[PDB]
Amino acid sequence: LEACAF
Amino acid sequence: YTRVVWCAVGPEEQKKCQQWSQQSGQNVTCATASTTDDCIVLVLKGEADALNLDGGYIYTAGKCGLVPVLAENRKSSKHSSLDCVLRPTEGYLAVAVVKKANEGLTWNSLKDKKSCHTAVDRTAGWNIPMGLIVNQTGSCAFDEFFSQSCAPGADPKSRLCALCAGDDQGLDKCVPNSKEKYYGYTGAFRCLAEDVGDVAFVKNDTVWENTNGESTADWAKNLKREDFRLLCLDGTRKPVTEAQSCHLAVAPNHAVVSRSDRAAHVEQVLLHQQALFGKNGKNCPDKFCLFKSETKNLLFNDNTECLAKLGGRPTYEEYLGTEYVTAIANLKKCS
Numbered sequence: 001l002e003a004c005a006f
Numbered sequence: 007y008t009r010v011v012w013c014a015v016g017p018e019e020q021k022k023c024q025q026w027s028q029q030s031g032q033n034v035t036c037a038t039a040s041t042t043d044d045c046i047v048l049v050l051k052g053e054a055d056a057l058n059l060d061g062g063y064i065y066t067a068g069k070c071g072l073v074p075v076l077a078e079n080r081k082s083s084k085h086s087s088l089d090c091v092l093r094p095t096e097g098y099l100a101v102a103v104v105k106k107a108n109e110g111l112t113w114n115s116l117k118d119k120k121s122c123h124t125a126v127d128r129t130a131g132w133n134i135p136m137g138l139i140v141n142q143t144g145s146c147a148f149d150e151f152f153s154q155s156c157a158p159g160a161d162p163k164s165r166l167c168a169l170c171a172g173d174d175q176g177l178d179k180c181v182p183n184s185k186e187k188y189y190g191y192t193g194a195f196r197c198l199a200e201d202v203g204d205v206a207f208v209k210n211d212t213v214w215e216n217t218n219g220e221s222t223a224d225w226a227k228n229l230k231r232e233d234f235r236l237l238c239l240d241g242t243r244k245p246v247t248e249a250q251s252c253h254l255a256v257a258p259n260h261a262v263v264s265r266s267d268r269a270a271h272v273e274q275v276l277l278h279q280q281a282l283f284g285k286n287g288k289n290c291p292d293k294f295c296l297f298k299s300e301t302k303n304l305l306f307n308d309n310t311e312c313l314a315k316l317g318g319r320p321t322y323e324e325y326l327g328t329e330y331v332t333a334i335a336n337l338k339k340c341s
């Protein structure tokens with residue numbers, strides 16, 4: 001439930 | 007107009023993409039990366055335009071800003087008068103498949119068995135079965151649930167990669183691309199067919215398309231459906247004819263993603279390219295078929311009848327569906 005993984 | 011730069015995952019997809027590029031008169035051209043996450047990073051950098059993705063990968067891409075453009079549509083189970091491009095997609099069935107001869111095995115006795123997965127982070131191979139297992143065990147320790155696995159993309163020295171076999175030389179063990187013998191739908195079903203694993207997490211279509219002469223490949227050519235069973239969540243085992251009542255979930259179809267600013271152009275080019283190379287395309291089979299592979303399911307699944315328009319210009323969360331998104335997000339809390 002957060003940001004881009006890169 | 008501009009060229010569309012596709013991103014191929016591994017060298018077998020790159021070969022296919024280079025054939026498409028030649029046949030397309032360079033309307034499509036190719037970039038290639040070793041993994042699907044690396045292709046998503048080329049697209050986020052603007053060094054590729056698009057690729058077609060399993061829904062679990064659509065979630066990674068979507069979190070990074072990429073949008074769904076067109077979805078795979080396979081032959082419909084019901085009659086429809088709509089053209090393929092305008093027919094609503096139906097979602098595929100994620101299933102757990104075992105051998106009938108392995109008589110003791112049910113969903114409730116999976117602990118400490120040997121498993122075959124398409125790849126980490128994919129829908130039927132990983133997010134659906136591991137999400138159900140973490141939930142039913144109440145534990146994030148899913149990397150210790152099966153005794154050994156082939157789960158391409160995991161740590162190659164770990165038990166999640168112990169069953170993976172790499173390429174003809176045994177290099178690239180556990181890489182999440184088609185060089186790994188047990189990658190993907192067909193590789194994970196081969197892991198089960200060869201009794202490397204006890205269970206394969208694939209989709210319904212994979213068991214049908216690799217049995218009873220539907221595949222002429224050596225390891226498949228002699229497989230019979232009746233030698234496999236599906237594991238139902240209520241602990242029963244059924245024949246593989248019963249997938250509509252013995253699946254783990256319904257998955258959103260693989261789909262093409264791009265940056266938002268390139269979506270429209272990628273869409274227009276793809277609609278044209280499948281008119282030339284798609285099923286019943288003008289130049290398929292004479293010259294090139296976009297939805298067939300030298301090996302298996304390269305760029306697109308070989309059971310794709312067309313890429314279809316999406317309804318409602320959907321965000322990635324609308325395309326995947328709220329329930330699937332929430333399941334992925336719950337599982338990713340373990341990592």
Ligand SMILES: *[C@@H]1O[C@H](CO)[C@@H](O[C@@H]2O[C@H](CO)[C@@H](O)[C@H](O)[C@H]2NC(C)=O)[C@H](O)[C@H]1NC(C)=O
Nearest residue numbers: 081082083084099210211214215220248249250
């Ligand atoms: C499980 O998958 C198989 C393979 O895609 C489906 O069987 C195909 O169904 C189509 C559309 O009905 C038929 O016209 C094809 O000939 C079938 N293929 C084969 C190889 O038999 C099957 O319908 C799917 N089961 C469920 C419940 O969705």
Ligand SMILES: *[C@@H]1O[C@H](CO)[C@@H](O[C@@H]2O[C@H](CO)[C@@H](O)[C@H](O)[C@H]2NC(C)=O)[C@H](O)[C@H]1NC(C)=O
Nearest residue numbers: 133134136137138141328329330332333334336
């Ligand atoms: C694993 O369990 C979690 C926790 O219950 C599930 O998350 C819920 O899913 C339902 C249906 O989408 C929602 O109404 C709830 O809001 C979700 N709860 C929470 C706390 O996030 C999740 O669906 C389960 N995973 C799988 C694969 O079934």
Ligand SMILES: *[C@@H]1O[C@H](CO)[C@@H](O)[C@H](O)[C@H]1NC(C)=O
Nearest residue numbers: 007029030031033278279282
């Ligand atoms: C290349 O794209 C241009 C512009 O759409 C079009 O005129 C031409 O037909 C395309 N050719 C092929 C082979 O895809």
Ligand SMILES: [Fe+3]
Nearest residue numbers: 060061129130
């Ligand atoms: Fe998938």
Ligand SMILES: [Zn+2]
Nearest residue numbers: 253254255256
């Ligand atoms: Zn269901």
Ligand SMILES: [Zn+2]
Nearest residue numbers: 318320321324
């Ligand atoms: Zn919307």
